[PDB]
């Protein structure tokens, strides 16, 4: 059973390798020109922040470029109709099918 | 102290050319005679063309021909100028002042024009 | 206009002896490909100082206009974008310092300053004249100062401009010195270099401005101040 | 190497000026006052470069038709411009200018005979 | 009735910018070699720099045959200096010619001796003023009469540029002086 | 190589005259004389840069100035060279400076 | 996930190096400038919001729901830049502390500031003491993951 | 492609343009095309 | 997180370097630069335009006109243009 830990962990790694690409591509652009380097400017904070925020909000999977249909509906709006309802949704378990 | 450096220079020059003299096949006697010679030597107008109405704004040339005054040969590090006030940042440096010889590694410097 | 295309199942799609299934996608908006590229730079800069989304949209609106005039074509695009952002911040009534815009942008103070003035002339628009109060909030926060000190500082700044004790002086210097005075009369002391690092202004410029305000220090404090350090024992340099 | 390229450019210029007379490498060195190029280099230029260069024709001991494949004649190649049904396959603005005199005067005259100019 | 409430205080001229064409091509390196009060650096800039003590000035001489003269404190002395520069060029052996002399810019300044209200001035003249206390300490005022650019400082000092003739300075100042006195502290 | 400037010096000139003696007596060749001049330059430059350690302060009035080929050329008048161990006043001086 | 996995991922295996194409068409004497970057210690603030002023403040998970914010906290990392140029110098390394992103916080976990408070304090914060937590808040909505 | 022909239409580029045209008109009528990738919307969804 | 210093230090460093020596080579030379250029073409059969300006440290338009006068150009199927100075 994949809980928040293994799901976010796959997701955060997806976000981090992508960030790693943006620093490399930026530093490569700098060196081509040369002598004017900075490091906070190379990093795009939006990449991590929005990429996770997007996944949690929509319910989709991945950064959208590598599909989304394999982990549809893994994220939901917490039902709260009655205290037992909230408590039940937090204890929900799901099982993938065709 | 400084003739010593000149002496030092005699040492470096003589050693450094030995192999060169060798390559020409020139005997070491010529090298030593060179050293000894050298050592002994060491010690309103609507007209747009006539401008003769402004003659004499220049001075004697004359200053440069003689150069009899003491001379200084060196290198510059930084040169600066503010109005008619000049600022000089120099480095390296051989000076000759009224017959004697002097040296510096850095010189800093102020003048007006 | 046109949509994009990609991938291609797993049945066919020539690459024949080649390894390029069907065909690569194509561009369609080169002439504008640097306006989209501007927006990419604007949100990034914006997140480094964490502005609300509304300012960023305002900036996109300022940029679209300036671009559309082409009245300053040739100057650095990122400079034009950065200057748009600076204007947007004043028009939102939440001024930022130029020094703050250099922190986030790769364009120097000289070019942003030029572009700022040029954009205002070209766009036939003017911002409000900046005031000291506009920065009181942000600084005391980054200095973890309590509300009471922040309010004293605002009062000090207000009195200082009211008595015209330091005319001509930049509002950032007066702001930095008022904050310094406040923090020095409270338990929450702060060093010149620490404030200087936050405001971006050199600590010696604060020291001079403080030397300028000290002769009348008693008159500037609110009557609600609790004097943790009395004026009679207020540090001087 | 450079010297030879300067020789070729000179040679084109001298042909343009009108001096189509056959001459030798030794003569060009002299006239350009560069005989001190060294016998080794002189020879290598003479009996390797200026023999593998297809622009000059070697006759007995001297170089002919000077700058390139040309027929010269006073740039008054009227029959050539004619050239019956073949019609010259097509003349080039650059070659006529290189030939001797500027083209413009000749072209203007040629525009009122039977010739047409295209910007190709 | 006087023109203004307190008349002029003769704004004083401080700097003049003019150009002149020598009419022929020259060899700046030779010039640099010959001249005694000049400097030349192709790796830095294309023109040769000369400076004379008379009225104390500086000139920019191009290989094209154009020269520019700056620093004079009057138009006659700038015409004078340019003629002197042409003279030394002649004295080098070059066919110098005093052609196309023209004043391109004039700079002036004066003081009013009292502190002033700048926040108000920028408020009431928003269309023209562009006061940026953060960047440059003084207020930049763009007049559109004799189209002149002014720099006004809190101490009261005023600098003017963009002028082609002295009258434009007095006129631009004659316009601005009542307003400024009117914001006296 | 280098500033070649030190060829103008007394030190540099006394060398060339000594070399000239050897050339008139044909004890050496001009090419050999030039190579000796090149090695002397390197040795004197090394000697200046590595051995020399003293500094001097100076003031005065500028009479004339020149800059070309990366070489500065001045002529000052009424100069005062001031040191912690020396003081020297002179009416006029010519200064050449390369880098 | 926060205590191990995130730290493990940035410490793991992405050290990177970069080197311009110097000595192009010519060169020789030296060795093409090169730069190395590696990421270390990671830091995660309590959940924070930033007003238009730019003033950062303690956010409360109820305030996040009524205004529609996003209950998340800012993340920072130790980064080093490290030179051992091809000869003249091997040291000139610099320590930085840098903001990299905002991570959503799951309610009443060890990093959601509500965990350290008692029944009376949560009741005072206007957040119900009997709520179970464990759900993210994004854009004003409480969003729960399905196992 | 019309301007391209009109002008200096090469050969391989014409074959490419025909193939791209053949794809777009087909995908307009039918975007299912078992042996080919599907025309998509910028959001990622398949074109209807 | 990120202090503001009116300009990047290293950018300022870029300025400090730029403000000493410039690639604005003055060409009242033509011949010696060219004499050098022949020497360069002795080192390899062909060169790329970006390096050819780079090895000459000079403005492109005059050199381009030189390449127009005596030289030739060739796309070796590498998109990028390459030149030769052989008068053959």
XYZ file of N, CA and C in Angstrom, chain B residues 54-109:
168
model
N 45.059 84.355 -35.148
C 45.171 83.561 -33.934
C 46.586 83.026 -33.753
N 47.529 83.554 -34.520
C 48.905 83.092 -34.413
C 49.399 83.091 -32.965
N 50.534 82.426 -32.757
C 51.230 82.326 -31.466
C 50.570 81.635 -30.258
N 49.681 80.666 -30.469
C 49.119 79.965 -29.316
C 49.973 78.770 -28.899
N 51.103 78.591 -29.570
C 51.984 77.453 -29.314
C 53.353 77.907 -28.806
N 54.089 76.986 -28.187
C 55.359 77.306 -27.537
C 56.535 76.516 -28.123
N 57.685 76.580 -27.454
C 58.948 76.073 -28.003
C 59.019 74.541 -28.025
N 59.556 74.004 -29.120
C 59.454 72.578 -29.460
C 60.462 71.569 -28.886
N 61.759 71.780 -29.098
C 62.556 72.762 -28.378
C 62.734 72.299 -26.940
N 61.627 71.987 -26.271
C 61.667 71.346 -24.963
C 62.102 69.878 -25.099
N 61.992 69.316 -26.301
C 61.868 67.871 -26.485
C 63.140 67.456 -27.187
N 63.678 68.408 -27.942
C 64.868 68.215 -28.757
C 66.072 67.925 -27.873
N 66.162 68.655 -26.767
C 67.301 68.553 -25.864
C 67.181 67.367 -24.907
N 66.106 67.343 -24.122
C 65.886 66.305 -23.110
C 67.091 66.189 -22.178
N 67.745 67.321 -21.927
C 68.980 67.350 -21.152
C 68.654 67.127 -19.683
N 67.396 67.377 -19.334
C 66.951 67.235 -17.959
C 66.942 65.759 -17.600
N 66.847 65.461 -16.310
C 66.907 64.079 -15.864
C 65.740 63.264 -16.401
N 65.993 61.982 -16.641
C 65.020 61.122 -17.295
C 64.618 59.976 -16.371
N 63.433 59.431 -16.615
C 62.838 58.397 -15.784
C 62.185 57.429 -16.760
N 62.520 56.154 -16.616
C 61.925 55.094 -17.417
C 61.334 53.985 -16.556
N 60.071 53.671 -16.817
C 59.287 52.853 -15.906
C 58.062 52.248 -16.577
N 57.121 51.811 -15.751
C 55.871 51.227 -16.212
C 54.697 51.880 -15.502
N 53.506 51.790 -16.086
C 52.353 52.405 -15.447
C 51.403 51.310 -14.989
N 50.746 51.562 -13.867
C 49.771 50.645 -13.294
C 48.370 51.206 -13.472
N 48.247 52.505 -13.228
C 46.971 53.198 -13.305
C 47.225 54.669 -13.606
N 46.415 55.238 -14.489
C 46.551 56.642 -14.838
C 45.189 57.291 -14.701
N 45.170 58.461 -14.076
C 43.920 59.086 -13.688
C 44.030 60.599 -13.835
N 42.894 61.248 -14.050
C 42.858 62.660 -14.387
C 41.533 63.267 -13.952
N 41.612 64.423 -13.303
C 40.433 65.104 -12.791
C 40.674 66.596 -12.910
N 39.922 67.228 -13.807
C 40.168 68.606 -14.215
C 41.585 68.716 -14.756
N 42.343 69.661 -14.217
C 43.747 69.794 -14.566
C 44.628 69.089 -13.540
N 43.999 68.286 -12.686
C 44.721 67.529 -11.672
C 44.898 66.086 -12.113
N 46.136 65.619 -12.025
C 46.516 64.316 -12.538
C 46.943 63.403 -11.404
N 46.668 62.115 -11.561
C 47.045 61.140 -10.555
C 47.707 59.946 -11.218
N 48.810 59.496 -10.636
C 49.652 58.501 -11.282
C 49.907 57.360 -10.321
N 49.691 56.166 -10.850
C 49.941 54.912 -10.172
C 50.882 54.114 -11.048
N 52.124 54.004 -10.607
C 53.191 53.472 -11.431
C 53.734 52.217 -10.774
N 54.576 51.504 -11.508
C 55.202 50.289 -11.012
C 56.469 50.163 -11.821
N 57.451 49.439 -11.278
C 58.778 49.230 -11.886
C 59.312 50.549 -12.484
N 60.557 50.621 -12.930
C 61.276 51.778 -12.435
C 62.755 51.953 -12.191
N 63.365 52.642 -13.145
C 64.761 53.042 -13.105
C 64.777 54.562 -13.272
N 65.473 55.267 -12.385
C 65.506 56.726 -12.441
C 66.958 57.171 -12.525
N 67.197 58.253 -13.260
C 68.507 58.893 -13.274
C 68.454 60.380 -12.962
N 68.939 60.748 -11.778
C 68.795 62.113 -11.279
C 70.121 62.817 -10.984
N 70.579 63.555 -11.989
C 71.761 64.396 -11.867
C 73.016 63.592 -11.713
N 73.088 62.524 -12.485
C 74.240 61.672 -12.434
C 74.021 60.444 -11.588
N 73.009 60.396 -10.717
C 72.960 59.132 -9.992
C 71.737 58.318 -10.376
N 71.780 57.030 -10.056
C 70.809 56.078 -10.568
C 70.009 55.503 -9.409
N 68.703 55.383 -9.615
C 67.776 55.031 -8.555
C 66.723 54.109 -9.136
N 65.997 53.423 -8.264
C 65.087 52.372 -8.694
C 63.884 52.323 -7.775
N 62.757 51.875 -8.314
C 61.577 51.644 -7.503
C 60.725 50.547 -8.124
N 59.895 49.917 -7.301
C 59.033 48.842 -7.769
C 57.602 49.335 -7.934
N 57.215 50.309 -7.113
C 55.915 50.964 -7.244
C 56.048 52.462 -6.950
N 55.315 53.282 -7.701
C 55.292 54.728 -7.479
C 53.891 55.331 -7.563
N 53.566 56.198 -6.609
C 52.243 56.808 -6.544
C 52.454 58.312 -6.381
N 51.477 59.110 -6.804
C 51.756 60.153 -7.772
C 50.623 61.105 -8.104
